[PDB]
Amino acid sequence: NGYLEPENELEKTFKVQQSEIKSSVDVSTANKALDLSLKEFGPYHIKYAKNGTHLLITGRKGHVASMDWRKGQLRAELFLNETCHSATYLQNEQYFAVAQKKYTFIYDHEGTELHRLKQHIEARHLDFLPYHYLLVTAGETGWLKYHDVSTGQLVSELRTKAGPTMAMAQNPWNAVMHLGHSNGTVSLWSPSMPEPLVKLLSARGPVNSIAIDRSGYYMATTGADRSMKIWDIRNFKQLHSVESLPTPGTNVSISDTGLLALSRGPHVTLWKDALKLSGDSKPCFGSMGGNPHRNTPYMSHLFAGNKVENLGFVPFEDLLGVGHQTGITNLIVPGAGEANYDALELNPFETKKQRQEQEVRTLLNKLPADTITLDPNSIGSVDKRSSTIRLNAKDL
């Protein structure tokens, strides 16, 4: 993995200019740090693919473009007149679902539409559970609903009973969806049982954003109380709680190396070593008198005047795509990526034939919609009843 370090006592890691690292880094990554400027349509939600291969931009007015960004390749660029809140890819670059004004639509590789969902009667946040082939939607109505996108079925019409769903986020390790409502409740859900599995109470007021670490072990949340919480998940214990950051945190995103990303409206602030369990690893803003027991943030970047509506890291590169009002920017964050991707599942050099074969392999090995569990290792177990020691018909 890449990294940086001060290697002095004067300069710091956070007051490092993107111009400076774009000068001191190689030409390929300095060329990959793209900055699209799109003005006439609205704020641009950003969704990369599961690998780093493509990019889906949505303007809130009308504008969705699925494009390769490494090579400049227009795949599907369409202005549909109604508003689009968010959108995502499905399993490849070949399909992408856009959450339009009310009806959620899904689209082919070249921009044709394929399904106007009669259900998902509105939508605000989509996600895709990739091993389960489940397109999950939540929004203004209190309905979290799951869609098996392979056979085109519905799976679960889960009633939230908590008003709208302010921010949802997928746990990438046990595939439970963490909704965060207006109550401060971050309730985490599975399509098998209607009652919400586990109702965390993270923040006060509405919860603005949730982001799950890729190891499934930490959950970072921001509320409109100007508060950010780090959560253990496997033990359900509030790790540490940054109170009173000087503006409401709009979005959080955690990279693939445990790297916290907080969007403070016009700011992007990145903390390294913020997902440990100590008291040192609480992310702060100042080393008070030069205190070596703080997390002064790893990097920071103040934008010009534009509200950043969503962060999102690039999977297998050291750069994060942040989406704001007047367009998209990639930010060189040198420790923000798995260098050693595993090419058996997802590959940033994948060609056409292995793309077809990898998707049909996942399509045969799609996990069923029932085994979404709070812990993934509870399938080869025995029942909690029908007691442990077996009896071989001698003492019954």
Binding site: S192, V198, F236, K237, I379, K384
Partner: peptide, 15 residues
């Protein structure tokens, strides 16, 4: 009131 509530309905469709 408290931090976390974990309800214990064991699921009869992954029994």
């Amino acid at each position: 009131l408290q931090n976390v509530i974990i309800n214990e309905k064991v699921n009869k469709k992954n029994l």
